[PDB]
Amino acid sequence: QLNDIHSFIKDVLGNPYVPGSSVKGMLRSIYLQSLVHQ
RNA sequence: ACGGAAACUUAAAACCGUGUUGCACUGCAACCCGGAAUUCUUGCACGUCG
């Protein structure tokens, strides 16, 4: 059946957030990635 | 055979004995080891499922 479950990042109380490093790394996959269009 | 001829001015004896170049006196009074320098800038927990 359903096995053991992974973990998201939380702050100090179980309250989660999207990381700032990933949303900085999100746009690292954008501005170089977009306008290469040999 | 010259008032002539002989003779030491000589022998010993400590310029010694008592006596501090000594007594009173800060190598002391005043000062900062003190002022100006980002532990920083590049960095996604993810590729992987008959």
Side-chain angles (χ1 to χ4, degrees):
Chain A
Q1 41 90 52
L2 198 56
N3 297 113
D4 306 338
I5 200 152
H6 273 171
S7 315
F8 204 61
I9 308 98
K10 299 101 189 155
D11 50 2
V12 291
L13 318 181
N15 305 132
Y17 52 87
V18 66
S21 159
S22 49
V23 308
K24 181 77 185 186
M26 273 165 191
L27 65 95
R28 203 82 186 192
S29 282
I30 295 285
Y31 189 67
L32 187 45
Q33 275 61 25
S34 63
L35 259 64
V36 185
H37 285 189
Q38 68 104 36

